[PDB]
Design a protein around this ligand. Structure first.
Ligand SMILES: [Cl-]
Ligand SMILES: [Cl-]
Ligand SMILES: [Cl-]
Lengths: 278, 278
């Protein structure tokens, strides 16, 4: 039996961002994905211009109503959200998660709190109470606890403070460590009982590829649904992101080499061992 | 260098149809896909009810304008279309193909002519003049030449008549052969110089899975872009569709087992040799 994730993110026709970065890696790992596209744009916004449009917040919920009407919502094992442009879209995600958990009480919500008036406020004040897992980057974690974080102890303490508000797991998808060499890319994952740090090479780019955070959350969600332990899912995520970003760097590209490097999403060749962060 | 296909088809959030059937298999085979979603529905229409909506025809072209504005249209190696609900959407596909070929004269258009007033007429009267390849099923082929087809000779003759109008290749994605056993599923591919017949087992279903034709066209497009000969692309398509439909049948499912059977999209275990159809 194949697991199912409802992924509620942006769609771009060209390139990779949002669902265009997240759906294929999760499928390639062996998990089904129901992509609810909150927008359809020609390309991601870091090119500086794009065409297309967003669906409205009520239409998001209506799509999930349709899935419910054909009897499929109990099959949803997880909900994943990432960048949302408006608080109205975030409210629809809340409504959708409630509907999914009513149909399947075992379902969990993985909120990647990517940070219009009200959207930072929504992610900080409201989403922790409904998310089973959150995946902030370093600056998003600082906003979630309302203070600066520069040590590993401060990072773990902050994650545990956020966990006390509801989430059972915090994935710091990029951790800044003032004591770490500048050519290393650090990550951290924390639960009530566990804390794991990990590190991969940082590849240099003139402009940062879009979608690395979306890929990170997607691989972690898929490996978790496939039954990995916290540490195993974390290490596979670190290694898979390493493989894709390395391949992007090696080819001198800007858009992630997701299709070209797909074998190493599923079976990364270069592995990085996590270490105890507590 | 990875090839790129612009795939202009429906999107369904749950299940597989249109781009939800076509995008993942092409990516899994090693080709990039730019999905231009003509609609976003909750699920495919053979459940009998759905929610969601279509984008308008002008918005389709505007998405491609955006890709052109960031300089990417010369990278498009093929355009793929399948089911279109309105002649206005079909006209937008025509406009898009013209723009793509202006940016890249080597690009080709693969029209799966899935058959509102005017859409059969458009596919029969207008699309042959612009499509480099068409993938009708048996009844669509009969409509394209305006007569009944029951022998293999009649099928090859009909394909060659259609080729004389413009297309260089006709993939009959399901060929009805009155002389073939009822538990066989036949296909045919014809060019000016070649004709290949092939056959796989027909798996019995209470209701036919949606997306088999979309999967067929997608695998054939991807294998062609990867450099396969006509016969090689045809055989890989036959074997990959066999693998997915067999896995769907074996699990007693209705929606195609695309993710579960993905290894056999790329490397089918059971192979069927084509034979000369001329
Ligand atoms: Cl950060
Ligand atoms: Cl995909
Ligand atoms: Cl038919």
């Amino acid at each position: 039996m194949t697991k199912n994730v409802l992924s509620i993110q942006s769609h771009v026709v060209f390139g990779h961002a949002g669902n265009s970065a997240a759906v294929f890696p999760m499928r390639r790992l062996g998990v089904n994905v129901w992509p609810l596209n909150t927008v359809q744009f020609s390309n991601h916004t870091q090119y500086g211009h794009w065409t297309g449009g967003a669906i409205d917040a009520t239409q998001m919920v209506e799509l999930v109503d349709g899935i419910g009407a054909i009897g499929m919502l109990p099959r949803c094992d997880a909900v994943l959200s990432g960048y949302l442009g408006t608080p109205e879209q975030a409210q629809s995600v809340l409504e959708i998660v409630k509907a999914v958990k009513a149909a399947n009480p075992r379902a969990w919500y993985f909120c990647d709190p990517v940070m219009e008036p009200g959207i930072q406020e929504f992610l900080v004040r409201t989403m922790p109470g409904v998310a089973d897992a959150m995946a902030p980057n370093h600056t998003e974690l600082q906003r979630l606890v309302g203070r600066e974080i520069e040590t590993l102890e401060e990072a773990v303490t902050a994650c545990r403070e956020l966990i006390a508000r509801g989430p059972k797991l915090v994935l710091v998808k990029h951790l800044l460590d003032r004591n770490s060499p500048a050519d290393r890319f650090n990550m951290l994952v924390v639960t009530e009982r566990e804390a794991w740090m990990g590190q991969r090479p940082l590849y240099p780019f003139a402009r940062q590829p879009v979608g690395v955070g979306d890929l990170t959350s997607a691989v972690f969600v898929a490996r978790t649904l496939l039954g990995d332990s916290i540490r195993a899912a974390f290490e596979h995520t670190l290694a898979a992101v390493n493989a894709v970003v390395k391949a992007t760097w090696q080819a001198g590209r800007y858009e992630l080499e997701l299709v070209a490097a797909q074998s190493e999403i599923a079976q990364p060749r270069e592995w990085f061992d996590a270490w105890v962060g507590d």
